Design a protein around this ligand. Structure first.
Ligand SMILES: COc1cccc(-c2ccc3c(CC(=O)O)c(-c4cccc(OC)c4)oc3c2)c1
Length: 188
C-alpha cells in the first residue's frame, strides 16, 4: 500500500478513547517544534487539507525546560483560555529559542503584554481555575499516549504521525506528505 502502519505513521497499541480528532503536542523549548511552526507551518497546512470545521487541538508539554517548561504550559493554557494563540505563538518561540530572552514566568508574561493582552487579563487568567483545568487537560492528553517526544500528532487516539518516514530534501514536499497523511488517517 502507499500508506502503511510503520512508515508514514504508527498505530497505538493502547488506543485512547474519546480523544480529539487531530491532537498535536509541542514545546516552546523543542527545536523541531520551532521548525514545524516557524519554517514549515505544519499545523496550518494540516488544517487546510481537513474537512472544514474539523477540530485541531494543540497542547504544550512539560517534559522539556524543567521549571520554565511547566510555566510555558500554564501560559499556553492562558493563551488558549483567551484565544490568543495566534498572537503569542511566534513571540514565545522566538523568546525561548531565538533571542533567548524568556528566562522566567515574568518574561513569558511580557510576551503577552507586548502582544496586547492587558496585565489584569493575563494575571486573572493565569491564576484561574479554568486555566488550572486546562493545564490538567493538556497533561492528561499527553499522559494518555505516554508522550516522551515532541513534536507529535495523533489522529483519533489511534494513529501517530511518523515524520521519520518522509522526505526532507524539500520543505514543501515534506509538509504536504505530512498533511496528506493526516488527511488519509482522518478518513480511515
Ligand atoms: C525539509 O524541511 C525541513 C525544515 C526543517 C526541519 C525538517 C525536518 C526533517 C526531519 C525531521 C524529523 C525526523 C527525521 O530525522 O526524519 C523530525 C521529527 C518530528 C517529530 C518527532 C521527532 O523525534 C523522534 C522528530 O522532524 C523533522 C523535521 C524539514
Amino acid at each position: 500500500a502507499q500508506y502503511e502502519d510503520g512508515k508514514q505513521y504508527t498505530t497505538l497499541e493502547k488506543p485512547v478513547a474519546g480523544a480529539p480528532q487531530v491532537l498535536e503536542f509541542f514545546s516552546f523549548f523543542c527545536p523541531h517544534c520551532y521548525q514545524f511552526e516557524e519554517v514549515l507551518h505544519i499545523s496550518d497546512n494540516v488544517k487546510k487539507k481537513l474537512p472544514e470545521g474539523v477540530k485541531m487541538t494543540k497542547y504544550h508539554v512539560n517534559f522539556m525546560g524543567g521549571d520554565l517548561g511547566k510555566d510555558l504550559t500554564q501560559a499556553w493554557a492562558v493563551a488558549m483560555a483567551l484565544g490568543v494563540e495566534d498572537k503569542v505563538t511566534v513571540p514565545l518561540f522566538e523568546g525561548v529559542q531565538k533571542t533567548q530572552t524568556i528566562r522566567s514566568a515574568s518574561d513569558i508574561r511580557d510576551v503577552f503584554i507586548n502582544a496586547g493582552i492587558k496585565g489584569e487579563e493575563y494575571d486573572a487568567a493565569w491564576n484561574s481555575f479554568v486555566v488550572k483545568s486546562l493545564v490538567a487537560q493538556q497533561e492528561k492528553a499527553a499522559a494518555d499516549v505516554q508522550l516522551r517526544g515532541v513534536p507529535a500528532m495523533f489522529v483519533n487516539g489511534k494513529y501517530q504521525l511518523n515524520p521519520q518516514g518522509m522526505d526532507t530534501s524539500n520543505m514543501d514536499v515534506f509538509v504536504q506528505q505530512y498533511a496528506d497523511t493526516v488527511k488519509y488517517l482522518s478518513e480511515k
